[PDB]
Design a protein around this ligand. Structure first.
Ligand SMILES: [C]N([C])[C][C]1[C][C][C]([C][C][B]([O])([O])[O+])[C][C@]1([N])C([O])=O
Ligand SMILES: [C]N([C])[C][C]1[C][C][C]([C][C][B]([O])([O])[O+])[C][C@]1([N])C([O])=O
Ligand SMILES: [C]N([C])[C][C]1[C][C][C]([C][C][B]([O])([O])[O+])[C][C@]1([N])C([O])=O
Ligand SMILES: [Mn+2]
Ligand SMILES: [Mn+2]
Ligand SMILES: [Mn+2]
Ligand SMILES: [Mn+2]
Ligand SMILES: [Mn+2]
Lengths: 318, 318, 316
């Protein structure tokens, strides 16, 4: 019942942040996999807040090229209200997600309770396109732009995103696993001086130094809450094939566990997003089972499960 | 040949330390792949001491929940005498194994001739449950507890193991590759302060520094014979799938060869166990061939094979 | 475009340096995957010098055990000629290869214009067998032996290789990825003191320290042109299965990109070989697709593609 193992589960069955349908079943397959039980199998305080209901906005006309903006803005608006609710209740928010546009609400609602948070973004992509730089028009590739304070005056008024007040600065976010960056995204990345560890860096330094540099960069000045937004495609498709945008050359299964293991040991985890699990895009039933089983193992390591073993505070020899 | 390449081969077709049948064929398939001939091709002096006849023990009721204790204890007792015999002949004992419970006999008979030995234990598991902390009753996940001096007093009188005397100390064994550890094992691991590199530590430091710390921890004070107990499930199941208890996220083929190449270069390899190859557990015939090939390759690196190249002390240009 | 992105492309559909047919289709499948256009989409100045026509030599009698000496010798002689020409045009020679015996011509022609070049050899093998140390007799395992000045006199007079002049010293080549070396090659490797990073060294040091030590070893004294000879079997068969001699335990896709990404940032890439892609050696159509696409990615990384992203100095 430690703070590190005190959890509030929020389901976010949302998919309109991206074209490929099925990512809304994310919260369903993760629950079906036995996540809450396996969390309770560890010494975890688990309270389920259910699946957020998302109202179907039938006529959600696009903003220029950005599609379904009112639907994405409302879903994140509900998530922000719900995330802050479980944070004021002392629990670590565990958003069980569809597409990564929900990171707007998850981080915002987290920010209303802990405005001094830092963000670790595990992803293959930066998701830092603005509504003017996007070529896909999909909002799951834009959430960071709505959330950075330095990007104010650059974000046009998108219908449904009026409640969005930027809550993090460029110095309070670190990327791990980038290997598919748009040209506009790369421009923002280097112009803001955002700390990132692309797969070039992970190869160069190893996931060991990557985590060492990541945590000290974020927890150097002061100790502050950590929000980990984990996009399942941050790991190689050989472990998470059932996702919207897979890119080869990703983080290994071991590296994904080591990231989450090292973040748990800081004791400062405060919010978690497990996004972009799509049980429709599995070429076989095993590809979905493999993806879900991987996202579950990632989450369990976020809350104490260590590869070296775990044990309760008793004498097992008596 | 030289001392590092003078080998005495002991087939150990025993399976009653674990539930799944077939691991007794381990010696058969390893020989069939040509392990003897490939060792001789790299200037090894190899003597084949034959496959040990393990007489049937029909009345072998369980000790509490521990299964087949007398068959396991006598096979390890017979292996212990056999290993000590080849060590007295000046040869490196090579045990081609069934289940890992034979390590009780492999290490004990080794210690009888070389009581100052150190153990490197490559495995996904710690194999350190006592007959009382075990929940599976399978003796192949208990051999280390029988061998540790610091556990004297916690091993009950198990039928078949009255010959057993703990021969190695807690500071004379190093684990590499752990990722599947029972809570009672984790308690024992930490309380006795055993040196270990789980998959987490291998991810943090890399196999290069792991082997540098391993060999310095064991050989730093004084040089001494090394005993390597290699469980095949220490590597990832993508390389050794034909094994009893495969666990995802293991050491790679490269990492397995680097461990064994580094151990050879010390010139202090004295005993070697190649355990848990179960040719009946491959989902396809190729998976069996792939497991055996990896096992043969790791055995060949133990006795001189190097990826950088090998050559005889002659003038290849005449 | 900039020097590091101005390329002359040479297709070398040659296979008679090795016994498995199909590697001559390397240039065809690589073009077919759109390699040229993909290079142009990242602001590269691409000039296509076409595929080299290799005439058939009927009376190609063996030189002892060495097979097809006059076809291999003439093919590399032509490639050396065409590589010197693109080098004279101030372009980076990109050789879309068949078997690795063509490196005899690629490096010789490159050394004709830049005799101070340094070679990086990404390969599971050393390819340093002499015509007398070889047991296979396949010349795609002998190219480095013809190129090293320190082995002059150890190489017999082989028909087809009278034009060859040893053009690099053993102190100017760095091997990366070794894991299958013949006894005679390893003797040569140790005797001549060639700098090398086998899979053992990549395991021990990591790909980052290997690249830093490689670039420092070749360019520490002074800037000079770099010739990258990339045998596709340097990567693990799980990423490049459609090749003649797959060896397990190879460089990862990531390590291949990292090597090529780091080589680009020096701005000194001057010659490139993409060798030993054999589309007829894939057990499934996907295995061919995987091998080519991996080869394509390694190539684009040699000319600026970066996993962290790219952008023109234009976006806000
Ligand atoms: C190819 N580019 C043009 C589009 C590309 C598509 C996939 C998304 C993935 C977002 B996530 O990693 O959260 O699934 C990012 C992207 N950059 C964009 O902006 O839509
Ligand atoms: C998971 N627990 C419940 C049991 C677990 C099963 C697998 C064995 C592996 C033995 B070996 O390393 O020889 O393959 C170890 C184990 N600890 C035990 O004690 O049987
Ligand atoms: C088996 N050994 C004895 C021979 C071996 C076969 C494969 C070639 C690979 C050439 B390449 O690296 O260009 O694909 C090297 C080799 N040394 C030789 O010389 O033929
Ligand atoms: Mn994302
Ligand atoms: Mn095991
Ligand atoms: Mn074991
Ligand atoms: Mn090769
Ligand atoms: Mn080659």
């Amino acid at each position: 019942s430690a703070k590190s193992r005190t959890i509030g589960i929020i389901g976010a069955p949302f998919s309109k942040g991206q074209p490929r349908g099925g990512v809304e079943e994310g919260p369903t397959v993760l629950r079906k996999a036995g996540l809450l039980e396996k969390l309770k199998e560890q010494e975890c305080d688990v309270k389920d807040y259910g699946d957020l209901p998302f109202a179907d906005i039938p006529n959600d006309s696009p903003f220029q090229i950005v599609k379904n903006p009112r639907s994405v803005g409302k879903a994140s608006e509900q998530l922000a209200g719900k995330v802050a609710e479980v944070k004021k209740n002392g629990r670590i928010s565990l958003v069980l997600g569809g597409d990564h546009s929900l990171a707007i609400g998850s981080i915002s609602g987290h920010a209303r309770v802990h405005p001094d948070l830092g963000v670790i973004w595990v992803d293959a992509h930066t998701d830092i396109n603005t509504p003017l730089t996007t070529t896909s028009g999909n909002l799951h590739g834009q959430p960071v732009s709505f959330l950075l304070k330095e990007l104010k005056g650059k974000i046009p008024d998108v219908p449904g995103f009026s409640w969005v007040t930027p809550c993090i600065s460029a110095k309070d976010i670190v990327y791990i696993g980038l290997r598919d960056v748009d040209p506009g995204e790369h421009y923002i990345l280097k112009t803001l001086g955002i700390k990132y560890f692309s797969m070039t860096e992970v190869d160069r330094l190893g996931i060991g130094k990557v985590m060492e540099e990541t945590l000290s960069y974020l927890l150097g000045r002061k100790k502050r809450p950590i929000h980990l937004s984990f996009d399942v495609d941050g790991l190689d498709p050989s472990f998470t094939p059932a996702t919207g945008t897979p890119v080869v050359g990703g983080l290994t299964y071991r590296e994904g566990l080591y990231i989450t293991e090292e973040i748990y040991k800081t004791g400062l985890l405060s919010g978690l997003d497990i996004m972009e699990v799509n049980p429709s895009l599995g070429k076989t039933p095993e590809e979905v089972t493999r993806t879900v089983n991987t996202a579950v193992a990632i989450t369990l390591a976020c809350f104490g499960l260590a590869r070296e073993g775990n044990h309760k505070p008793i004498d097992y020899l008596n």
